[PDB]
Amino acid sequence: AGCKNFFWKTFTSC
Secondary structure: OOOOOOOOOOOOOO
8 A cells, every 4th residue: 555656756656
C-alpha cells in the first residue's frame, strides 16, 4: 500500500 510508482516522479514514487 506504501510507495506507488508513478504519479510522483515517474519513479518508484513514495
